[PDB]
């Protein structure tokens, strides 16, 4: 038993991390087949970040201006192109560690594992959720740009995130592996605001089901509610509106624990209006919203990967 | 910036996980050089766990009674021996993925990464702390036994934990890689109690330094205190007694932030007596004690691994 914030095994993604140097900027790249993917602001100086014209800045760059390093071994760059906010560097060598992979654009509320790197070397791994305002609350120091977020199913790594920016609020923004930013963010050092951060209501509910599964039942109440009435309570506390889809997704968890989704919605309503009174749920004094319903089922079953 | 519960990259340990079957019991093993390490209760049936005589149970076992599987490939067992609570199975093939490795016995309060596995396949990775009562709060389902905990420095994996038991309280116990249990626990299905769980005081302090580093300063007070007087407060709240060694270990964090250790001890005293008043520190409404001072320095610097 027990329930934990858990990350996918990072072994497949580690064999894909390289070091990318352009001029005096060094960051991380992702080496799949004979292409290296990295944030396009590798071509920027510290001053260029204040207002970069990437097209013009890239005109002055050639293939031999990109230093791609895997271990002590340099890759030969034969071509380069800018797809949105990522640079695609064609190299002469397919990555012999290329796993089965996909590029996916996740939705708000979905989770993924981040393999934080510096100079192409993996430093650590942790779980992150795509906040409804398309930010993430991660851990990114200078040089972590290019670190990727991913999900694994069986043998397939689903790459979904690449780190590009830290916002003046301290939260993080990035793109998918096609270069399109999550949210209204741009790769410029200027004042950009995330929207109102709201709570992923369906994730809190799955976390409450995981709590009931593991013995934490003190919050189960004698009340029940409706979808509209629960939602009317959810707006006051900046919770994402719950829908029938969210209800459907929680069905398996409802079936195992025998607690109707609308019941758990009512137990959540009591927690929102009365607090936790100094108690904890799965060792937390807050309401966790970074576990999807699928994350709960995986941990409560034992899914493994090849 | 940002601060996160982070686990080491698991790629090196993944290439060491195998499946071990003895009779009808299947669990995980660790394949280093030409030896497989696994919990000795792989030789037990469900009834044997109630009172096992491992010596006698092992007499009836031969080398060909151990099914060791790496992928679709079986290992040939040439020898077997029982070191305390782990079984050492000599195989005819050195692991070609054997990394530089060490067997270490960590101390209470130290942290490590757990690569949870089922049937020799890695399922996930998360961080754990050796509680002062030598338990760990992990995530372990049926078949996770044999999953290992480790730390990485440069190229060296320091194996320190192997999972063997879930306690009737839902917490977890295991051995080092020489088979010696952490704590007074035995590999028997009987009532065993952990001691009073206490809080790792030096870990809370390093976490408070990490908070100040990342902008959370609302808890910094105008008071200071002594070691004895702070400790007198720590016993009431079941905190581990703080020593000069703990003070010394926090020196680097004291030096960077310019806050004396005894000051932070006084800010902790106010948090213990007045609570958090509904505020959060690094996104938590509790006082986290599973980050060592070294874990904080690593994240606030960017240490990487080869």
From Swiss-Prot, chains A, B:
| Effect upon mutating residue 49 to A | Does not affect ability to cleave and inactivate human TRMT1
Query: Domain Peptidase C30 spans what residues?
Result: 1-306
Taxonomic superkingdom: Viruses
- What does the UniProt record report as the effect of altering residue 189 to A in this chain? Does not affect ability to cleave and inactivate human TRMT1
Catalytic residues of the enzyme: 41 (for 3cl-pro activity), 145 (for 3cl-pro activity)
Cleaved signal peptide residues = none
Catalyzed reactions per annotation: TSAVLQ-|-SGFRK-NH2 and SGVTFQ-|-GKFKK the two peptides corresponding to the two self-cleavage sites of the SARS 3C-like proteinase are the two most reactive peptide substrates. The enzyme exhibits a strong preference for substrates containing Gln at P1 position and Leu at P2 position
The residue ranges for the Cytoplasmic side of the membrane come to: 1-306
Task: From the record heading this protein, give the residue positions of the covalent cross-link Glycyl lysine isopeptide (Lys-Gly) (interchain with G-Cter in ubiquitin).
Answer: 5, 90
Tell me the compartments it is located in: Host cytoplasm; Host Golgi apparatus; Host nucleus
| Activity regulation statement | Inhibited by pyridone-containing alpha-ketoamides compounds 13a and 13b. In turn, alpha-ketoamide 13b (tert-butyl (1-((S)-1-(((S)-4-(benzylamino)-3,4-dioxo-1-((S)-2-oxopyrrolidin-3-yl)butan-2-yl)amino)-3-cyclopropyl-1-oxopropan-2-yl)-2-oxo-1,2-dihydropyridin-3-yl)carbamate) inhibits SARS-CoV-2 replication in human lung cells. Inhibited ex vivo by michael acceptor inhibitor N3. Inhibited ex vivo by compound 11a and 11b.
Sum up the protein's function in the record's words. Cleaves the C-terminus of replicase polyprotein at 11 sites. Recognizes substrates containing the core sequence [ILMVF]-Q-|-[SGACN]. Cleaves and inactivates human TRMT1, preventing tRNA guanine(26)-dimethylation of tRNAs. May cleave human NLRP1 in lung epithelial cells, thereby activating the NLRP1 inflammasome pathway. May cleave human GSDMD, triggering alternative GSDME-mediated epithelial cell death upon activation of the NLRP1 inflammasome, which may enhance the release interleukins 1B, 6, 16 and 18. Also able to bind an ADP-ribose-1''-phosphate (ADRP).
The UniProt subunit note reads as follows: 3CL-PRO exists as monomer and homodimer. Only the homodimer shows catalytic activity. Interacts with host FBXO22; this interaction promotes the proteasomal degradation of nsp5.
* Protein's UniProt name: 3C-like proteinase nsp5
Source species = Severe acute respiratory syndrome coronavirus 2
